[PDB]
Homo-oligomer: A and B are copies of this chain.
Amino acid sequence: EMHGKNWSKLCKDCQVIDGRNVTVTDVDIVFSKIK
């Protein structure tokens, strides 16, 4: 199970680029999820 408390961010089986200022440039595909 998962449980965050009042500001806590949490994940499982995840891919995160968490950060204050975040820029991505010239990309071909940012998000891709084939199943």
Q: Enumerate chain A interface residues (CB-CB to B < 8 A).
A: 1-35
Chain B residues with Cβ below 8 Å from A3 are 1-5
Top-5 shortest CB links A-B: A4-B8, A19-B22, A15-B31, A23-B23, A25-B25
* Bound CA span A2–B21, Å: 27
Question: Which of chain B's residues have a CB closer than 8 A to the CB of A11?
Answer: 10-12, 14, 16
B2 and A12 contact, CB distance less than 8 A: yes
Could you write out 25 A-B pairs with CB less than 8 Å apart?
A1-B2, A3-B5, A8-B9, A10-B11, A11-B14, A11-B16, A12-B14, A16-B16, A16-B18, A17-B22, A18-B18, A18-B19, A20-B20, A23-B23, A24-B30, A25-B25, A25-B26, A26-B26, A28-B29, A29-B29, A29-B30, A33-B33, A33-B34, A34-B35, A35-B35
